Design a protein around this ligand. Structure first.
Ligand SMILES: CNc1nc(Nc2ccc(N3CCCC3=O)cc2OC)nc2[nH]cc(C#N)c12
Length: 260
């Protein structure tokens, strides 16, 4: 099996992930180098799908001029029938590496943190709010964390979703803020520090949504050595969006700034 994209030929090692219409494969180029290719079959596709897929290709194009922490889009073929995106290839997604129930070198966790902030800050700077960041949204390449889905299109799953990372304003605002990504980054850090996400314990997802949106519900923050990390997690995970810490604040925080 093979894939010709904008004149170049790539051979399919392994499918890595799937989506609605999409498939992402790990492939080699004519020079036995690693890439990822995302395939989207557009034959069946509303114009909103079409429009969403179009948008983020463009945003991905611009956005990678501004940050190493966004995965690169080398090339793309697009026609009325399919999309091919030749992209830099991750090693695995944060959500799989996390579930290799490991424990994290405290200075890799700090560097991964730095990485998510850089990347989310970048999309924020060009007007994007993911409002659904999860570990699946991050790839590990060269001991960096790089972002892949800007939450715009029909997002993929690496080869059932999740709601521990839902910002309370997301639950409340059903009957957007950049601060709602701080929350989900919050849960991913919390997860990364305490081996579990905040309300990961309320296993019935009605009672879990309430907890998230519930004032006299208390997230537990077990004391730990890096008390700066404890403060970050504590200000990320405030229920009041206006009381929650901004991304530009987080970037001026002792946790990322002082080399402990
Ligand atoms: C998920 N989509 C992507 N995935 C990867 N890498 C990768 C991700 C996951 C895994 N898994 C998953 C469980 C077992 C295992 O190995 C393996 C992987 O590499 C072989 N690189 C990418 N670049 C652009 C992408 C898009 N869109 C993209």
């Amino acid at each position: 099996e093979c894939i010709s994209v904008k004149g170049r030929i790539y051979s399919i090692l392994k499918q890595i992930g799937s989506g609605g219409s999409s498939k992402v494969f790990q492939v080699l180029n004519e020079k036995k180098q690693i890439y990822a290719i995302k395939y989207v079959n557009l034959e069946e596709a509303d114009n909103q799908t079409l429009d969403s897929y179009r948008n983020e290709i463009a945003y991905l194009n611009k956005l990678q001029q501004h940050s190493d922490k966004i995965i690169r889009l080398y090339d793309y073929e697009i026609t009325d029938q399919y999309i091919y995106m030749v992209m830099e290839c991750g090693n695995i997604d944060l959500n799989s590496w996390l579930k290799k129930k490991k424990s994290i070198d405290p200075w890799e966790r700090k560097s991964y943190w730095k990485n998510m902030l850089e990347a989310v800050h970048t999309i924020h700077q060009h007007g994007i709010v993911h409002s659904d960041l999860k570990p699946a949204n991050f790839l590990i390449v060269d001991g960096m964390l790089k972002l892949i889905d800007f939450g715009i299109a029909n997002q993929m799953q690496p080869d059932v979703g999740t709601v521990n990372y839902m910002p309370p304003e997301a639950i409340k605002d059903m009957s957007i803020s950049p601060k709602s990504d701080v929350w989900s980054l919050g849960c991913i850090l919390y997860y990364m520090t305490y081996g579990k996400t905040p309300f990961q314990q309320i296993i019935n997802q009605i009672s879990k949504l309430h907890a998230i949106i519930d004032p006299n519900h208390e997230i537990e923050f077990p004391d730990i050595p890096e008390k700066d990390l404890q403060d970050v997690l504590k200000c990320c995970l405030k229920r009041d969006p206006k009381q929650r810490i901004s991304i530009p604040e987080l970037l001026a925080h002792p946790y990322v700034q002082i080399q402990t």
